[PDB]
């Protein structure tokens, strides 16, 4: 039948098995184990996985191989800058926790060591630096600072210059092949948005935001670096201020009254850099992250169902008299597919709404008292709306009362489908499990015959997504009435995997023809013993209860009678 | 992942080189050069781009070689109408500034000289007219200086002739075939809405209008001149008040009662007239623009990434016993090509956010400190708007709630558009840079999985492009979300070009494995160190953000409910 | 560029010719010359264009060879009804005037003859005739007049008859093979509302037709003529009242007294009848309407144009260093295509407002001022029309905003377009102007790039073209910021025709290359002078003047706050 083909598809299995398994395949991050100190208690293993980073952005930040300085009390204070003007900072690389600050620039022209200047707890454990390591093919600034002072107030601007393209390292012949330079001539733009170092505006220049001016400001930085050892020195060369905009970007000269009274006495001076650099991590001292790979299986059994039988003369009259064969299919189709199915949809129904609760996510793999193994994939979620078409509508026109209940009903589905979609990352998951193409999410809609003229919304081509494909689907039970089921499933391959919404379990069942004695009769029996049965995998289910209906659309004629009949006029 | 691949466009590179640099070509209009170092200075090259060209209208205009008379005591003033009838005007052509007035009519038989007549200064420093000038093929006059005068009260009016039929000079030979002929001889009409000089209609011919009539006028206008040596005369022959029209299209006589009054000593005379005359410029005397070509050019190089690990037992093979861990490939796509791109958009909107302020658009080429290249092409322009569900609309009833929902965002996405472009002038942009093909612009429209159900309209086709093609993708981050992001892209092209949004610089990686011994630990490593960059071109780029929608979509449920039980009338 | 030819189409002109011309070939019908008599005069004649027949229908028609009673007192007045019956009436055939009435219906056995009881001054000065000619195969009945007397009170009815094909005169020989019969054999009904010869609702019959009773008359007629000398006869041989239908259908006798009453002493006779007959002119008699072509001559000349220059280095070759041309194209294209394409359609706007006045039309080669030829064709017409959008709509929620603008804006532009074409004849114009085809007439759309948001209407497959097809083109020039220009265009030809808008007369530039010696410096030069001049022909243009809209579209971010904030309730 064509609603139990559209939630469960058929997979057939040959008659000499009980039933299949599957085989399900997991991705995960391990970060380590605990148990290194002894209790003689469980080893604990701190499991995620790897899915769940469709979502999740901390799932996956790693910065280990990174250069960047480390603060030693009396060691290398004399190269950084004075804890006077911006005390450190906590920055976490890996699992160490250390503080870090803003290198100085070579006042008389001494330079500094990198690979000195960045020891991490992590690397001294490890054992001292070699020369083996070597600085990776990008070096650039990625933030300088500069101080802003007018009558004695100092404030502090970070700003990020590693997007502009002139604060990357560049390759110089001067010295033998391998230093690299950095060529920095261009002009910074402080802007009317630009936030001192703690997160707020200026007020220094507030005057000129005020007027709404963006002050440019000419930065001339220059340095060296060796990609061998480390060695390498970085000095500031001029900085002046340099133009001030208007509105519309004309440009308004520094001996402007406009800008000179909110300029003087105004100083701007570079006061320190940091550098954004990399091994070229071949050595492999630093260790990334672990990904473990393990096997999950279920196993499926089939059962044998009550038999159907019929009674016949046996000697004669097997062809006219008394029932022929197809009377045996008739009553296997209509019973034993179409009926057990909407009895495994509606208990499926329940079981969600009993263990998982109304409108509540859960974490990937956080539930193990449910069906199939979509668990592994996408996220438990179940959900619940009533739509109470009385109360909601209401129009004493009874000519466009199927657009208003069609407007509600779309509105309800569609809303409810994509809150879903949101909360559960299914698409995702699709994206992530198939390659070369991503075939859109099909969303199911099988319901019975009452509703079905309320779900197409006239007018209108695209009825109930933008991103999705759909079937509807009626069926004759007296159970779903004014009832809505809806769930994701895969329109075109044919077997079993944890993304698909339901399968039928199906081996073909031979009929038994021979002539059995009952208590004083000879008659020969035929006999059909079906052996099938519905599984389902998606922990997904969406239902839509409507009631009232038929009184808001009884409400059609029982409007008050609002006659007008007077001689015409023209 | 679709989002990824839609914006940045994957440019492959060998693993050869540390990246790819993109030399862009730019011609410029030279107008003068500004600063001297006898004071101090630099010189200051005043170049502007011509693509500029694109949105105004005068820096690429150029009249050098038209021929206007001059003024000047002594020496041409016969030549010229009395100047206390209509004073001199001041009109600015070259670096030139001079006078200019209406030639007086020939009576006599005696004209004037115009090629003589039209030397200005620049014309002067190269030294005076020798034969070399020819003036062009065409002639034609500009404008008749005709007064209408009642009394002793005298009018003056500007007609221009210029856009008539027959007031361009017509060959003939009956002469030296260097000689040019006049034959004008049509009516002119001063119709009721014709205005002075000083502006304001006329006081005399006031009654007419205020009746809705009109005034036509016999002409007869006849000139000679040479294209050699610049001899010539023009001689008016006739002039008269010839007929009179009503409001509907038909005749009234000069002597009917309508407008005998104010027809009766009303007597019009020809003045004066000027000519559009040229240098046929076979001459190379008078330079029109200079432009110059400058290249510019920038270095976008590839960094490596921080790699991924496996462990795996050593005694056994790798190359025919077990997977290639497809688990390792999985988290190298998740990790590295995804979560990255969300991070670095998000990172260019608040740069951009930063930097340019909200809905301030600047002149090309006015800031260096993005990154990029588009402009040297695109005026940058950055704004953003929030929408607030809840205050700006009104409804409570379900049905409804996603129709006025689509009025809003599609509203307002069309609005963002279109006002962008028109600051932007981005598809003039596209027409200039591609000779031989126009691909229509693609507006690209990035958002979470929560709002693309109110992005595309229900009943139509077009719904956010009405003369824009447009493609929706999805991602499941949570840092989006219920956020849009909106830029230009190019549909069918794989290259960094200067127009492109942005390139994602790809150099495969090696997978590499080998024995590492690790705290006593004999295993197999297999490390793959990924190795790309998203770069950023195009410093446009439009955010919206919703909120407090969940509030809105709960109003479809706090609704009051509006039940009316009336009995059925009929 | 877009907007260029969509306006302009680019028609190649050989470099040989200074320009083109286009000849005009017109039908003008004749209608007459006044001034034979002797006064030495400017004769004017009276010539009308055949085209203005598009409009009306009074241009070109005759019945001047069609024959008619002429009424001539005191010689044939025997063979006319008395005028004691009704009043003589006057026609106008040709330049001749005369009265006319209903021939007598003769019992008494003697004819009339046709031929002399017609014939006109022009017939008789020209020869009285002669048997020269012979009459036309169809001669019919045109009027029946029937007196109706009844209680002494006479109403005369003028029955049209000609519409019933048993008047038609049937050939059908028996003593002659030129004589044909009549035989009318039908009934005439009385409708409730036939007006009277007097010109109102009847007295006698009111009774009846207030009740909406209808009353058939059966009427006998037989005639006799033969074509060959106009020899006739006519006698009327049988009337009555036949019988009388209500307002349905069904028959009523006449002794039935709802009818009986208003019946009681009413005779019907018929008094007169008049002729449909006329001359074959197989001899050709008789002058016809005259046509006669005209043909007028328009030249236009190609001028040229102010230079460009680039300057290169001489002694080195010119391929590889400095600007190799693109520079040139480039700034050939935008200064010499876009910037003159909107100034000169911006000067033609002005100049069409200056003369034709805002919606008034005007007639057909009434104006010659204007520059084209299309006013040899269609009516000459300007109209203007401003939008307020604020203050024409009264919305706050920013939903619908979208929808209501572009409604109000399509809305007013299909107007405008239908009203203009409906005013101008430019349709039939198109349509007369080739057999075979007749392309629908298409409407161009050049405006700024910021309303084209609103043309397009949501969901409509017709959008503009109701009756039309349309083409939206769009330009960054900020002088048309807010303005709408249109017009009507020819896109499936290329070549110079009146019905084109309007023509780029273009030629192909030659590139220059001699080096000029420019104080002292020897430097490479190339020139790239163009020449070309856009045209007008069409004088029909229609401008949408939109303003103050961008305070309507921030009446989006304008409205006062709607919350609706209750506990949900159901």
């Given amino acids: 039948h064509e609603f139990a083909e559209l939630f469960y598809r058929t997979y057939i299995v040959t008659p000499d098995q009980a039933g299949f398994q599957l085989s399900i395949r997991r991705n995960l991050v391990w970060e380590g184990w ?7 208690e469980k080893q604990e293993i701190s499991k995620r996985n790897i899915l769940q980073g469709l979502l999740d952005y901390t799932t996956l930040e790693t910065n280990s191989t990174e250069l960047i300085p480390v603060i030693q009390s009396g060691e290398n204070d004399e190269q950084f800058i004075d804890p006077s003007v911006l005390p450190a900072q906590t920055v976490k690389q890996g699992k160490d926790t250390f503080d870090t600050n803003f290198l100085k620039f070579s006042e008389n022209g001494e330079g500094f060591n990198l690979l000195m200047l960045a020891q991490t707890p992590s690397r001294l454990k490890k054992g001292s630096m070699t020369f083996t390591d070597s600085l990776d093919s990008r070096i650039a600034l990625k933030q300088l600072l500069i101080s802003v002072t007018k009558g004695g107030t100092t404030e502090l601007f970070a700003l990020d210059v590693n997007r502009d393209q002139y604060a990357a390292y560049t390759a110089t012949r001067e010295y033998n092949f391998r230093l690299m330079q950095l060529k920095f001539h261009t002009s910074l733009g402080l802007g009317e948005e630009s936030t001192t170092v703690a997160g707020a505006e200026s007020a220094l220049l507030k005057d000129l935001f005020d007027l709404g001016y963006r002050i440019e400001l000419d930065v001339k930085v220059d340095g060296e670096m060796n990609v061998e050892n480390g060695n390498g020195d970085t000095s500031l060369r001029a900085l002046r201020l340099a133009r001030v905009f208007d509105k ?36 492999q001292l630093e260790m990334g992250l672990l990904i473990d790979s393990d096997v999950q299986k279920q196993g499926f059994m089939i059962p044998t169902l009550p038999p159907l039988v019929i009674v016949k003369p046996a000697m004669v ?25 909407v009895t495994t949809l509606l208990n499926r129904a329940d079981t969600l709404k009993s263990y998982l609760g109304v409108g509540v996510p859960h974490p990937i793999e956080s539930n193990l008292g449910l069906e199939g193994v979509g668990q592994y994939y996408v996220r438990p979620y179940y959900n619940e709306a009533t739509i109470d078409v009385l109360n909601d509508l209401n129009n004493l026109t009874s000519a466009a009362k199927q657009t208003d209940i069609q407007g509600l009903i779309v509105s309800k589905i569609n809303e409810m489908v994509y809150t879903a979609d949101q909360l559960t990352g299914y ?35 695209r009825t109930v997504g933008i991103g999705y494909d759909y079937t509807i689907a009626r069926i004759s039970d007296l159970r779903m009435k004014d009832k809505i089921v809806m769930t994701f499933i895969l329109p075109n391959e044919s077997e079993p995997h944890p993304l698909q919404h339901g399968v039928l379990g199906f081996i073909p069942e031979y009929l038994v023809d021979f002539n059995m ?43 008050d009678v609002n006659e007008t009949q007077v001689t015409p006029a023209s």
């Fill in 34 to 40: 605990t148990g290194e100190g002894l209790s003689g």
């Fill in 248 to 283: 519309e970007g004309k440009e308004i000269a520094l001996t402007d009254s406009r800008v000179s009274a909110a300029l003087s006495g105004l100083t701007v001076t570079g006061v320190g850099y940091s550098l954004e650099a990399r091994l070229t991590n071949i050595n």
């Fill in 317 to 341: 009259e097997d062809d006219k008299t008394y029932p022929r064969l197809e009377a045996l299919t008739t009553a296997y189709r209509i019973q034993q597919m179409r009926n057990n199915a």
């Fill in 427 to 461: 698409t995702a998951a699709l994206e992530a499990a198939f390659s070369g193409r991503s075939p859109k999410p099909h969303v199911a809609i099988g319901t019975d015959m009452r509703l079905p003229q309320y779900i197409q919304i006239n007018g209108d081509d």
């Fill in 517 to 559: 004695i009952r208590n004083q009769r000879i008659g020969r029996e035929i006999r059909l013993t079906p052996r099938y049965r519905y599984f389902n995998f998606l922990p997904i289910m969406l239902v839509i209860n409507v009631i009232n209906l038929e009184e808001a659309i009884a409400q059609r004629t029982a409007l």
